[PDB]
Amino acid sequence: PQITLWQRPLVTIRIGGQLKEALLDTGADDTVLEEMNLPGKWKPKMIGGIGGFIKVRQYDQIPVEICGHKAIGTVLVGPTPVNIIGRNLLTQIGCTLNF
Amino acid sequence: PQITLWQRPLVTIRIGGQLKEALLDTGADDTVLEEMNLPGKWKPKMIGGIGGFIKVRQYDQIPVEICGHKAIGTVLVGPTPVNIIGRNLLTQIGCTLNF
Numbered sequence: 001p002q003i004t005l006w007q008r009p010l011v012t013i014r015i016g017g018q019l020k021e022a023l024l025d026t027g028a029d030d031t032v033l034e035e036m037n038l039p040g041k042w043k044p045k046m047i048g049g050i051g052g053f054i055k056v057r058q059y060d061q062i063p064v065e066i067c068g069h070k071a072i073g074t075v076l077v078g079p080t081p082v083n084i085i086g087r088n089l090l091t092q093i094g095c096t097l098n099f
Numbered sequence: 100p101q102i103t104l105w106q107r108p109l110v111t112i113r114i115g116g117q118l119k120e121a122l123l124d125t126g127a128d129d130t131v132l133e134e135m136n137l138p139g140k141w142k143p144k145m146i147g148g149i150g151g152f153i154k155v156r157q158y159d160q161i162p163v164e165i166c167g168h169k170a171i172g173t174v175l176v177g178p179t180p181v182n183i184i185g186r187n188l189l190t191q192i193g194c195t196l197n198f
């Protein structure tokens with residue numbers, strides 16, 4: 001679909017049998033989702049920001065359905081203040097920026 | 100242009116006479132650029148991140164060329180690691196998300 005950017009680009013994602021709201025973010029390398037447990041083993045990952053680090057868990061071949069489009073990739077789960085779809089899942093649904 | 104997201108969407112912008120490389124970021128509401136000496140009156144601003152805040156200089160009707168498209172808007176200037184051009188200027192150049 002065409003998403004203009006006057007409002008935050010929030011969409012629905014179905015992941016782990018849950019329907020959640022997430023931000024399509026071209027400035028994120030990785031996808032970061034609010035806490036939940038998924039199927040599989042997880043690798044600890046410590047992600048950074050401005051005055052520190054946050055520990056998150058990395059799950060690896062998770063099916064996600066972003067606005068009906070199925071995509072498979074790595075998801076990081078942890079205490080994020082908003083669900084963020086990073087470029088790793090945006091490339092999978094063939095999303096481009098256009099102007 | 101139609102830009103794909105396999106690599107970081109970095110573009111050449113022109114602001115305050117100097118050329119810069121910046122990240123097209125749909126997740127960020129604002130445009131935050133590195134220290135440059137912009138001519139103009141400014142206000143201090145705080146932008147929060149992981150466990151803290153950083154102070155920047157808010158400038159308000161700045162002309163910014165982004166891949167030849169001129170846009171006018173607010174730019175926050177300060178110790179950013181990464182030059183962010185967010186939604187406030189992406190709407191101005193007619194940038195969309197499409198899939």
Ligand SMILES: OC1(c2ccc(Cl)cc2)CCN(CCCC2(c3ccc(F)cc3)SCCS2)CC1
Nearest residue numbers: 028030032047048080081146147148153178179
């Ligand atoms: O924009 C920032 C900023 C930039 C400049 C200035 Cl001056 C101030 C603030 C402040 C916000 N962070 C967000 C980190 C993005 C990632 C992440 C998402 C959620 C989460 F809980 C943890 C990490 S997304 C994947 C890895 S980090 C970047 C720099």
Ligand SMILES: [Cl-]
Nearest residue numbers: 049050148149
């Ligand atoms: Cl941060």
